[PDB]
């Protein structure tokens, strides 16, 4: 997250870190056994880290749980990033407590102007790299479809929407992918892609969770 | 043959390679400069 602020400790109890030796992507806990992330965050093995604030310091109150199943959307495409969403089934259920809990799925599509919260342990710089120990947060609004498309001609599919600031300075970044965009208490987006981070006229591009609510339900049921 | 463009985060020209994540979403900034030099 570029241009954000350090979140209050454990105030986003749905936020997870995906770890394959190091933090590399985010995700969101949507049920005791299931996490939503981005399909481009797939790796054969992933450890889900729940309850984190400082991802470098073992506080003794996290939960570290292997992914048992890692299921990319069947119409995900690496080259276009269409349908950039995936489900992770945890190998053991998460224990729900004040620091580890679920985020609700969306019940309406995302809407322009809506004020949301984006979070993660991704890069905090537009130029170079600084990966934070503590979880970062960014308040940002949904952009219009027109603005999204004008920012990225030829590249915005029906699965994609833009959130952020056309003036730059404030955006998600590398190693935020997979993490949440929460609006009015519901998971509306998955961090996906952008041209650089926090540049003028290059807002973040996010996967519309709402389009996948039935897929999520059906996948969970098929893998129970 | 080889293709180069400017990577905003790195401040340098980089080679476009097949198979990158989101390759078809790439912005090939300053392609003519980076080709010319590299």
């Amino acid at each position: 997250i570029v241009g954000g602020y350090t979140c209050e400790e454990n105030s986003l109890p749905y936020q997870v870190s995906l770890n394959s030796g190091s933090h590399f992507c985010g995700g969101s806990l949507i049920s005791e056994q299931w996490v939503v992330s981005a399909a481009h965050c797939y790796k054969t093995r992933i450890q889900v880290r729940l309850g984190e604030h400082n991802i470098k310091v073992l506080e003794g109150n996290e939960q570290f749980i292997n992914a048992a199943k890692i299921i990319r959307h069947p119409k995900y495409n690496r080259d276009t990033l269409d349908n950039d969403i995936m489900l992770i089934k945890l190998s053991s259920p998460a224990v729900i407590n004040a620091r580890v809990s679920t985020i609700s799925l969306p019940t309406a599509p995302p809407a322009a102007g809506t004020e949301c919260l984006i979070s993660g342990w991704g890069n905090t710089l537009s130029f170079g790299a600084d990966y934070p120990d503590e979880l970062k947060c960014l308040d940002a609004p949904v952009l219009t479809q027109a603005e999204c498309k004008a920012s990225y001609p030829g590249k915005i599919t029906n699965s994609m929407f833009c959130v952020g600031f056309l003036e730059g300075g404030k955006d998600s970044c590398q190693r935020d992918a997979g993490g949440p965009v929460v609006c009015n208490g519901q998971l509306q987006g998955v961090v996906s892609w952008g041209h650089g981070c926090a540049w003028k006229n290059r807002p973040g591009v996010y996967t519309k969770v709402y389009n996948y609510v039935d897929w999520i339900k059906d996948t969970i049921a098929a893998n129970s | 043959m080889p293709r180069w463009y400017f990577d905003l985060s790195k401040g340098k020209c980089v080679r476009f390679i097949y198979g990158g994540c989101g390759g078809n979403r790439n912005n090939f900034e300053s392609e003519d400069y980076c080709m010319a030099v590299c």
Binding site: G122 | W4, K10, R15, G20, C38
Partner: peptide, 14 residues
């Protein structure tokens, strides 16, 4: 030529 990086392109994926 220092501007001609041998490093793989970051690309757009976050």
């Amino acid at each position: 030529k220092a501007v001609c990086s041998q490093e793989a392109m970051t690309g757009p994926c976050r």
